[PDB]
Every structure is written in C-alpha cells, then in structure tokens.
Amino acid sequence: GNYNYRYRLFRKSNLKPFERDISTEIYQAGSTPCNGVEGFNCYFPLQSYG
Amino acid sequence: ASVYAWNRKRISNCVADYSVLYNSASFSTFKCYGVSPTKLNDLCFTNVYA
C-alpha cells in the first residue's frame, strides 16, 4: 500500500479555480470546537490513498 | 432488539432535526456512507428506515 499520495476529504468551503491550499489545519465537523487538537468531529484534512 | 431480529423503524411524514442527533457527544460513531452529515438538515427523502 502506497500512502505517499494524499487528498483533502474535508474543507469548509470550495476552492477557487487554480487555487492550491496546502494548509494542514484541523477541521471542525461538529458543534464542539477543536482548538487545533484532534478528537471527536476533529479530523485531519489529509487522507492517504490505499 | 437482538441483531438477528433487528426492528425496522419507519420514519416518515415528519420533520427531522439531524443536527440535534449529530451534536450529541455520547455518540462515539457517526459514519455516513452516501450523504454528508452537515447536509442532512437540508436534503429531503421519501422515508427513513431505522
């Protein structure tokens, strides 16, 4: 399994055309704030292909 | 109910506030395989099988 290729599953809004966003910021998918800490409804934006 | 005789609850003819169910912290697993969790309060479906 090669995991060197990563895609962004989660983002707060859609990208603009020809826009590159390389920010590894935690994503708030729920009501409880994350404050940069992983947990419930706080998922890493980058996930690897299997 | 037991898993071999799982009850099938039909939810229809009503308004569902999935945000209230989503924001409860006691749920340790909330995984959607065909829809988006944040779009449950916007989409409309014929009936729901529980």
From Swiss-Prot, chain A:
Disulfide bonds join 34-42. Attaches the virion to the cell membrane by interacting with host receptor, initiating the infection. The major receptor is host ACE2. When S2/S2' has been cleaved, binding to the receptor triggers direct fusion at the cell membrane. When S2/S2' has not been cleaved, binding to the receptor results in internalization of the virus by endocytosis using host TFRC and GRM2 and leading to fusion of the virion membrane with the host endosomal membrane. Alternatively, may use NRP1/NRP2 and integrin as entry receptors. Residues 9-44 are annotated as: Disordered. The gene is S. Changing residue 44 to S: In strain: Lambda/C.37, Omicron/BQ.1.1, Omicron/XBB.1.5, Omicron/EG.5.1. Changing residue 38 to Q: In strain: Kappa/B.1.617.1. Changing residue 29 to V: Increased resistance to neutralizing antibodies. This is Spike protein S1. Changing residue 38 to A: In strain: Omicron/BA.1, Omicron/BA.2, Omicron/BA.2.12.1, Omicron/BA.2.75, Omicron/BA.4, Omicron/BA.5, Omicron/BQ.1.1, Omicron/XBB.1.5, Omicron/EG.5.1. Changing residue 32 to K: In strain: Delta/B.1.617.2, Omicron/BA.1, Omicron/BA.2, Omicron/BA.2.12.1, Omicron/BA.2.75, Omicron/BA.4, Omicron/BA.5, Omicron/BQ.1.1, Omicron/XBB.1.5, Omicron/EG.5.1. It comes from the Viruses. Binds to host ACE2. RBD also interacts with the N-linked glycan on 'Asn-90' of ACE2. Cleavage of S generates a polybasic C-terminal sequence on S1 that binds to host Neuropilin-1 (NRP1) and Neuropilin-2 (NRP2) receptors. Interacts with host integrin alpha-5/beta-1 (ITGA5:ITGB1) and with ACE2 in complex with integrin alpha-5/beta-1 (ITGA5:ITGB1). May interact via cytoplasmic c-terminus with M protein. May interact (via N-terminus) with host bilirubin and biliverdin, thereby preventing antibody binding to the SARS-CoV-2 spike NTD via an allosteric mechanism. Residues 1-50 are annotated as: Receptor-binding motif.
